[PDB]
Write a structure and sequence with these properties.
The complex is a heterodimer of chains A (about 240) and B (about 250). With about 240 residues, chain A is α+β, with helices and mostly antiparallel strands. Chain A contains eight helices and nine strands. In chain A, the strands form two sheets. In chain A, strands 1-3-2-9-8-7-6 form a seven-stranded mixed beta sheet, sandwiched between helices. In chain A, strands 4-5 form a two-stranded antiparallel sheet. The two termini of chain A are about 25 Å apart. Chain B is α+β, with helices and mostly antiparallel strands. Chain B has a single domain, classed as Beta-lactamase (3-Layer(aba) Sandwich), CATH 3.40.710.10. Helix content of chain B is about 35%, strand content about 20%. Chain B contains nine helices and seven strands. A seven-stranded mixed beta sheet of chain B has the order 1-3-2-7-6-5-4, sandwiched between helices. The longest helix of chain B is centred in the middle third of the chain and has 12 residues. Classes of the chains: A alpha+beta (about 240), B alpha+beta (about 250). At the A-B interface, β5, α4, α7 and β6 of A face α4, α8 and β4 of B. The structure holds ligand 3VU. Ligand 3VU binds next to β7 of chain A. Chain A: Belongs to the class-D beta-lactamase family. Chain A: This is Beta-lactamase OXA-10. Chain A: It is found in: Periplasm. Chain A: One of its GO terms (cellular component) is periplasmic space. Chain A: It catalyses: a beta-lactam + H2O = a substituted beta-amino acid.
């Protein structure tokens, strides 16, 4: 079903980046990628895990409803941008790791395992601690699997209420225009080492007029200055494809 | 209770327009307006009616689901942007009048009347033709009632499924940033004369950090060139209030 577009490599070789972009028009049955081998290779999801984690938090009642406020206790957090009260959309958009570590703790291992099985989420390996498995643990997911998962969310076909899927979808909106709407989420596991790099992601979908395009990007990253390429490489490819 | 902030009148007089802005922080119990008399005055909703019309279309099954495509029959429409197949969000955002005239026809008078009673939607007067009552008919709604209605939608408290309310809410998103989100809808009944003006609206809500602001603006419009003031006057007021900007 998946085809290779070697012209998309221009955008990767120019920045000396080892990565993959998977782009699907209408459904995950019609996908194209720059690298067929890397398209199914599995990596730590990092903050892209906030999408299933938010759905699970709502499903289990850990997150009361769409208007739940996650209060800051005034005690130090890793990022200044996290040192404030956040809505569910705010906590997803600023990628507030401690908010989601607390949700994962409240969900617990049994319920987390059950939902990742329901969602067919990567290797479904939640070893490495309940509040760390997606950051430094054993959980791995491919770009192809991210697209399949996002397509299910878009269609309200995940094993969750349509209401909870709709709440998480509005939380994912990053661009809005009269005939163009983007839902997306970034991820970054850190810079690792040279030989064992970290991973950076950008996943989501574009609704342009009456068409839908699902996408998932990942790349090896050992230098934090390369981080914006997680959005600029996929954007340049979608621009060359006329999606914009 | 609703309070008057007459210091906002300079934003209207600067442009020689007659209008009202209603702004509520957290809930419709804490509102402020430049003009208490006009805040309760009822006007044709024009395209702001696409919000209840879309909810009613979903509730009645006239609109199948969130991914319903409204096909273009290839016949001339007033705007080039309307001459194409549209999604529900697309039809609301481009304000495609003919799509909603067809939804209203399919909903019909009895069902339309029942839902406008459930929603406490203005004067609930749908006379003037089933496909025209909100454009040139007898339907009227105030800026205060728009804020009450929008607050109910935000809280999923309208007499409709939470699912249908959530679908219409995503269709209304017009601005998105990590800690700033806007849901809004414009309306314009058509240009009138100075003595018999048309009405232009801008209604919606702003979610900024963990706060919510409900708003409704309307103005008399007697010159087509004044139409963008329906967004620039409320924007200047929200800027002076500290909602827009840091
Ligand atoms: B996450 O993937 O998104 C943010 C970073 C961003 O670019 O928005 C973020 C994510 C995870 C994360 O926590 C981590 N823990 C480990 N062990 N590796 S990454 C952090 C710190 C941030 C900022």
């Amino acid at each position: 079903s998946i085809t290779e577009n070697t012209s998309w490599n221009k955008e990767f070789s120019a920045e000396a980046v080892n990565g993959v972009f998977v782009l699907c028009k209408s459904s995950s049955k019609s996908c194209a990628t720059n690298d067929l081998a890397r398209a199914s290779k599995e990596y730590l999801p990092a903050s892209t895990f906030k999408i299933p984690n938010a759905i699970i938090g709502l499903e289990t009642g850990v997150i009361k409803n769409e208007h739940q406020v996650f209060k800051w206790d005034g005690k130090p957090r890793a990022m200044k941008q996290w040192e404030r009260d956040l809505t569910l959309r705010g906590a997803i958009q600023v990628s507030a790791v401690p908010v989601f570590q607390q949700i994962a703790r409240e969900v617990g291992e049994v319920r987390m395992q059950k939902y990742l099985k329901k969602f067919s989420y990567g290797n479904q390996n939640i070893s490495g601690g309940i509040d760390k498995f997606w950051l430094e643990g054993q959980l791995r997911i491919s770009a192809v699997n991210q697209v399949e998962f996002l397509e299910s969310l878009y269609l309200n076909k995940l094993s969750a209420s349509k209401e909870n899927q709709l709440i998480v979808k509005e939380a994912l909106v990053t661009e809005a225009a009269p005939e163009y709407l983007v839902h997306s989420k970034t991820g970054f596991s850190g810079v690792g080492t040279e030989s064992n790099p970290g991973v950076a992601w950008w996943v989501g979908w574009v609704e342009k007029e009456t068409e839908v395009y699902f996408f998932a990007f990942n790349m090896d990253i050992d230098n934090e200055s390369k981080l914006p390429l997680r959005k600029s490489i996929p954007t340049k490819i979608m621009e060359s494809e006329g999606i914009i």
